[PDB]
Design an enzyme around this catalytic site. Structure first.
Site, PDB file in Angstrom:
ATOM      1  N   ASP A  13      28.136  81.269  81.850  1.00 18.76           N
ATOM      2  CA  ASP A  13      26.786  81.763  82.033  1.00 18.76           C
ATOM      3  C   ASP A  13      26.344  81.445  83.467  1.00 18.76           C
ATOM      4  O   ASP A  13      26.798  80.439  84.082  1.00 18.76           O
ATOM      5  CB  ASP A  13      25.883  81.095  81.001  1.00 18.76           C
ATOM      6  CG  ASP A  13      24.490  81.697  80.921  1.00 18.76           C
ATOM      7  OD1 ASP A  13      24.243  82.848  81.446  1.00 18.76           O
ATOM      8  OD2 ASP A  13      23.638  80.967  80.307  1.00 18.76           O
ATOM      9  N   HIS A  30      28.279  89.513  88.870  1.00 17.63           N
ATOM     10  CA  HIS A  30      29.419  89.771  88.027  1.00 17.63           C
ATOM     11  C   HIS A  30      30.709  89.823  88.797  1.00 17.63           C
ATOM     12  O   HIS A  30      31.709  89.401  88.318  1.00 17.63           O
ATOM     13  CB  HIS A  30      29.239  91.031  87.230  1.00 17.63           C
ATOM     14  CG  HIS A  30      28.070  90.984  86.317  1.00 17.63           C
ATOM     15  ND1 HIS A  30      27.661  89.825  85.702  1.00 17.63           N
ATOM     16  CD2 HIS A  30      27.209  91.943  85.923  1.00 17.63           C
ATOM     17  CE1 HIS A  30      26.595  90.070  84.971  1.00 17.63           C
ATOM     18  NE2 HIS A  30      26.298  91.348  85.093  1.00 17.63           N
ATOM     19  N   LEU A 104      50.458  79.400  80.150  1.00 21.75           N
ATOM     20  CA  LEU A 104      49.068  79.425  79.610  1.00 21.75           C
ATOM     21  C   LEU A 104      48.791  80.584  78.631  1.00 21.75           C
ATOM     22  O   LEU A 104      49.189  81.726  78.869  1.00 21.75           O
ATOM     23  CB  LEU A 104      48.094  79.509  80.770  1.00 21.75           C
ATOM     24  CG  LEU A 104      46.595  79.466  80.410  1.00 21.75           C
ATOM     25  CD1 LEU A 104      46.111  78.044  80.151  1.00 21.75           C
ATOM     26  CD2 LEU A 104      45.845  80.088  81.552  1.00 21.75           C
TER      27      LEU A 104
END
Ligand SMILES: CCCCCCCCCCCCCCOc1cccc(O)c1C(=O)O
Lengths: 206, 200
Positions: A13, A30, A104
């Site tokens: 956030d 963004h 990962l």
């Protein structure tokens, strides 16, 4: 693994606010957050983290080529069903490409909710009930735990939320029962390698 | 407007240790802190207070709670509790079930995961006799406290930053407030601080 942290989850956030503080529109935030994503993913991969689960909280990709390169296995979690069918195939293809990767595991929550997640794992159990395959009294926590998202990974050790809000916001619910919760005011586009280091350090202590 | 607060009351043992005392003395100062928190909640118009004892009292306190117009409920797995205790709980709940002030939920042998799984055991017994009709709202109706205001705020005293398998389903949209204050020291001013955090 001095920090001993296998699975980090992040609520990213602060993109919007980050842009506004600079007098820029939302879109700039963004794009800045996207860069922060790549930075975080790198960091996780270079620190022996086994799983990184990212939740973009209030899009698209050419990163798959790069991820597949770094032996990253990619998983989208959430309700993809409603997505316009081109999107669904792209997701399927990206997942299939990296499915056999062994570095990962990167889960990217899309149209995801924690309650939805539990509910769907319930449907599955309720499916294997109707088939007469399983008894209603046989359902235990380990059971329903094998049917919720990311049951195959290490348990979420650490949940980070940037941007200053101190809530889960319907992100993982079942899976965070024992996780360390770390809240920072840092906005997501400024959350860097040191902040991530800061967070892992704090998970170490108990 | 904070309607339902839930508290993970940790730090009793550490408080005892810190005071140069044995564990039991931490448990009595913890009980006092419960009484203080309960009065505070009632005094400030909170509708529901849900309390999770984390690292038996009905005949001592039930009459006062009733006096004070508190409705008592116990949440958790009490199936393996003595039969006498189970009767007392039932009796106590029945006695206060019409009280209109604070609802006090005491979480006894409770686990968030257990609470959902036991709600899942219900729907799965009705599936044995629609597994495209079990949706969020349906499962919500079988989890603890669905008939009360949703949890707005979760307080955890004692310096740990985790939920430790307390409410999970129920805290999807709650504010989470962590304080280093040990439970026996958690007072009215600390409770206000947390209500302030919720207000912003
Ligand atoms: C406005 C009305 C004022 C009257 C308020 C009455 C409430 C009295 C309850 C005090 C005893 C606390 C038992 C519940 O929590 C625990 C449960 C199990 C084990 C524990 O150690 C504890 C603990 O000590 O924290």
């Amino acid at each position: 693994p001095a920090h001993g942290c296998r699975h980090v989850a992040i609520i990213m956030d602060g993109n919007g606010r980050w842009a506004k503080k600079q007098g820029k529109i939302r879109a700039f935030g963004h794009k800045a957050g996207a860069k922060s994503v790549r930075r975080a993913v790198s960091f996780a991969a270079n620190n022996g983290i086994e799983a990184l689960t990212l939740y973009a909280f209030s899009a698209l990709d050419s990163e798959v080529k790069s991820l597949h390169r770094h032996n990253v296995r990619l998983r989208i979690i959430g309700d993809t069903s409603r997505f316009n069918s081109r999107l669904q195939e792209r997701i399927r293809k990206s997942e299939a490409l990296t499915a056999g990767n062994t570095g990962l595991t990167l889960n990217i929550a899309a149209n995801y909710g924690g309650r939805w997640d539990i509910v769907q794992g319930v449907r599955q159990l309720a499916e294997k009930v109707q088939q007469g395959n399983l008894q209603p009294d046989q359902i235990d926590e380990e059971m329903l735990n094998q049917h919720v998202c990311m049951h195959e990974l290490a348990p979420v050790d650490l949940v980070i939320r940037t941007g200053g809000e101190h809530r889960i916001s319907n992100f993982l619910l079942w899976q965070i029962a024992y996780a360390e919760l770390y809240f920072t005011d840092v906005l997501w586009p400024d959350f860097d390698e040191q902040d991530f280091e800061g967070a892992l350090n704090a998970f170490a202590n108990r």
